Amino acid sequence: MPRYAMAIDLSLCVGCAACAVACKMENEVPPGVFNLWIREREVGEYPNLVVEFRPEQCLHCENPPCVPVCPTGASYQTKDGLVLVDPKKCIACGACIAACPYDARYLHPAGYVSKCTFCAHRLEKGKVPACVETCPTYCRTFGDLEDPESPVAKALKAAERVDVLRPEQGTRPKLFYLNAPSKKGLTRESEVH
């Protein structure tokens, strides 16, 4: 019934990869695959140099292309907006990886697809995700979008600007990048070459 979301204030992200490492430890994400990674890109030229540190992970899209594509039903979207995988039904076919626009998904070496989980295991015990917890810069917030006391909600409200990766896709990413450092918004590779 809530709408779970994550917001990352890029004006504060320094791209240390603490969240990324906290994730790997917590979810014991195996070598070679990542639920979370950082992307750092410069937009350039001296008087006007801009570096965007951008942590990427499952955005737990509100309209996830990775769910519909699943034949098994292992890819499901939860009532509060978490896209999760039930590995019991996963036939590791990769359809969801093909349909995920963000590279958030991987084949776990145990034979099923995995990806960030919004720390489902913690959310139920009433805790905040591990990446949100460890963040030194206090740039990531989390919570229920609909609860205005939520740290995501308040941050979205306080943001000077809010962006999302590949909005043009159908998805409605529920991971919001707040104050994007470049005036043109989130950095894209096509805008480089």
Partner 1 sequence: APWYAQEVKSVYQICEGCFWRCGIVAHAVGNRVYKVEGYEANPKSRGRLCPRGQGAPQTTYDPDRLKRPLIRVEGSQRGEGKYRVATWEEALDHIAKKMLEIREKYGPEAIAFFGHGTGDYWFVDFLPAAWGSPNAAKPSVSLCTAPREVASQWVFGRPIGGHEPIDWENARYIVLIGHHIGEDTHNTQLQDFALALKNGAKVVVVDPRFSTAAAKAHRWLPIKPGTDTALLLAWIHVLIYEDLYDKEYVAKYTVGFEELKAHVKDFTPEWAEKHTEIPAQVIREVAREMAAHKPRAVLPPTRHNVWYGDDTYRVMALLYVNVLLGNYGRPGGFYIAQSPYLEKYPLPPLPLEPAAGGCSGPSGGDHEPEGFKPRADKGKFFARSTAIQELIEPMITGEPYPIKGLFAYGINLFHSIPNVPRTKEALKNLDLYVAIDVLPQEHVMWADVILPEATYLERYDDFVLVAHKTPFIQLRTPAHEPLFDTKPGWWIARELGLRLGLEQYFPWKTIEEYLETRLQSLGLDLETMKGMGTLVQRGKPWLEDWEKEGRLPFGTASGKIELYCQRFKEAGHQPLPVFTPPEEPPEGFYRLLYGRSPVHTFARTQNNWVLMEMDPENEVWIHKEEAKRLGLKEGDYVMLVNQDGVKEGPVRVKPTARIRKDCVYIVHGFGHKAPLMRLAHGRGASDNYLQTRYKLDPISGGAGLRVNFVRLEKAERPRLPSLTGLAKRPFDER
Partner 2 sequence: AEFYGLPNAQEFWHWTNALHFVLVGLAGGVALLAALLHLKGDAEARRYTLYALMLIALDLFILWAESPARFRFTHIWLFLSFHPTSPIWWGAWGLGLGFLTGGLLYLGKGSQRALAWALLVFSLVALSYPGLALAVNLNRPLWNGLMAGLFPLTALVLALGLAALLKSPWALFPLRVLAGASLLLALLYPLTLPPEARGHLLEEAGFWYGLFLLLGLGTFWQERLAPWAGLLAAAGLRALLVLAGQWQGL
Binding site for partner 1 (CB under 8 A): 11-12, 14-18, 20-22, 24-28, 30-32, 34, 37-38, 42, 44-46, 49-51, 53, 121, 130, 133-139, 181
Question: Between residues 71 and 148, which has the closer beta carbon with respect to partner 2?
Answer: 71
121-152 CB burial, b ≥16 within 10 A, e <16: ebbeeeebbbbbbbbebebbbbbbbeeeebbb
Q: Which stretch binds a copy of itself (CB under 8 A): 1-9, 35-43, 104-112, 183-191?
A: 183-191
CA distance 147 to 21: 29
Query: Which residues ranging from 75 to 94 are in contact with ligand SF4 (CB under 6 A)?
Result: 75, 83, 85, 90-94
Task: Tell me: does residue 107 bind ligand UQ1 (CB under 6 A).
Answer: no
- 13 assigned to a ligand binding site: yes
Beta-sheet pairing, 4-8 with 36-43: unpaired
Number of residues that bind a copy of itself (CB under 8 A): 13
Which one-letter amino acid corresponds to residue 101?
P
